[PDB]
């Protein structure tokens, strides 16, 4: 006669399992593990240890609201000597005293999510059942059987574990790297991501089906990308582009994904006020990285966006080169999306790798929606039949622009524009370093190459001796007066008298032109034979301050007209006005669970004073909460603003401290500092 087995306590070995499963930061009060990999379990009994002869143990796991084995959401498996032939297995590793050391294995295609683990202990016809605990199962980039497997440890670290990174903005001529705190492993973020999955429309429709289809990185990526902005009602972010963000946080102000997700969850999942394309991409990247899908934020300069996948874009301009069309959509200065790493069994073989996910809703036949995961290689090959919006992503980097100047007869003359090529300087943060990696080659083959022609035919694409370009003498700062030049080259014997029209206007990052901040018109301009000419245009801070966006972008337009042959030359350039540098000083010795002081300062570059000055500091591993300091007194024209923020780093290793500066006339100024936290000792 055998006494019933009595479970004192079940230990889920958070420390060891977190270290093995690369989820150590995630393992706070719950257990977090990655699928396709075994994890330790320890059972403590009072009185007697488990008897293989007299005791029978079966484990059960459930994840959905409607768990099913068929759907893959529920599994029951028995204790065994060696690993058995089954997706879910439990095997004895060691037995000592009253403790049983087990290893539990999950299939590499198990659906991700929160699971309840139950044990049915049957002893001599008397059956009892316990709930051992809960655990969250995530995608495993380390597991070769997993669809998201990455062979390189460096890439796994960068695309899954690294909580800070860069978003590339500015201009193609002047690329800017904005620090961002993804903070995927910050407190509560994993639960918020699970809520984001649980409140998505497909879950509302079926729930059991949605939880079952969470086994797929494609499905989860699509759901998350839609949830960021596209989903009405339960969307994470609300997008605004008119430069009026007073009632919310301006899109440029954000320094991390964490605050956005926290505001969204804390307010009953109402859309957090004001984000733009890079904000959508950054939040999506945070969610995917938290879920274990390797993801990176990507920036494309001169992006042909919201053109309904049109590969030939035509603009009709007046005598000054101004684009007349009220219908037409401008070429974005830059557009951001994400790339996620996965196999694609739903497609023909050979399309595993980076998949482009654009969480910014785009106009399409059948409505406005984000563009689902499409293999980047398919876009490169021109294989637009490939599933999930290959035509839109392809148009993004390969569209052609034709510029027309309208005649007095009502006819249009095609101008020569060599300044503009769409799909420029596609950039992403490099692996394990702060340098920028150019990934344009992944999207497109070299121009005028055999492969390019090959791809264009598969994509059914295949579309006076004077030159002009816009020149910047040197870097120009926000708040100052500077000159730009129209540089004309006449490499011909002819002498020309031409028309030069120069217009400088403030512009948003998505191409919305504001009023002109500088103009010069020269009706009779002599261009000597075999010579060059520089015509200056003066841009004044007073002229651009009122309508300048937080992107600090100004567009320069030059139209050169040669009347005799009636030839039109067009040159356009986007200028980025440099913000003042934020000086960061780290005071004390950076050690875990020890006080650290960050001194942040900047010098006012404006001729006028600054009011409402605020410093905001954020950083996963450096501070648990965002920190804000307001400077009560105004900062006059030449003075410096300096404040000290107290930080309590809770994690060892390298972390990036992200800083934002806000003021009435100087907004969204960014700074960052790499801080390595040593052992507490
Ligand atoms: N702040 C700022 N600096 C820039 C910008 N464009 C270029 N610069 C910097 O100013 C200098 C100008 O370099 P380029 O613009 O590439 O060259 P350019 O003066 O236009 O003349 P070309 O080389 O003939 O085209 C370099 O030091 C650039 O880093 C811009 O938009 N903003």
Residue numbers in the entry: 1 to 463, 471 to 688
Excerpt from the publication:
Human TG2 is 687 amino acids in length, consisting of four domains, an N-terminal β-sandwich domain, catalytic domain, and two C-terminal β-barrel domains, and is the most ubiquitous isoform of the TG family.
Human exon sequencing data in the various sequence databases, including NCBI, Ensembl, and ESP, showed a valine residue at position 224 of TG2, supporting the idea that the G224V form, rather than the G224 form, is the natural TG2 variant. The 2.5 Å crystal structure of TG2 (G224V) was solved and refined to an Rwork of 23.6% and an Rfree of 25.6%. There were three monomers in the asymmetric unit, chain A, chain B, and chain C. All three chains were identical and contained GTP, which is similar to that of the recently solved GTP-bound form of TG2 (G224). The root mean square deviations (RMSD) between the TG2 (G224) and TG2 (G224V) variants was 0.51 Å, indicating that replacement of G224 with valine did not have any effect on the overall structure of TG2. The G224 site on the structure was carefully analyzed and we found that the amino acid residue at site 224 is a critical residue for the formation of hydrophobic clusters with neighboring hydrophobic residues, including V287 and L288, which are located on active site cysteine (C277)-containing ɑ-helix in the catalytic core. The active site cysteine (C277)-containing ɑ-helix, which is stabilized by the formation of a hydrophobic cluster with neighboring V224, was shifted to the opposite direction by 16°, especially the active site cysteine region. Stability analysis of the two forms showed that TG2 gains stability by mutating glycine to valine at position 224. Based on these results, we conclude that hydrophobic patch formation, via the newly introduced G224V, may lead to fixation between G224-containing α-helix, which is connected to the Ca2+-binding site loop, and active site cysteine (C277)-containing α-helix.
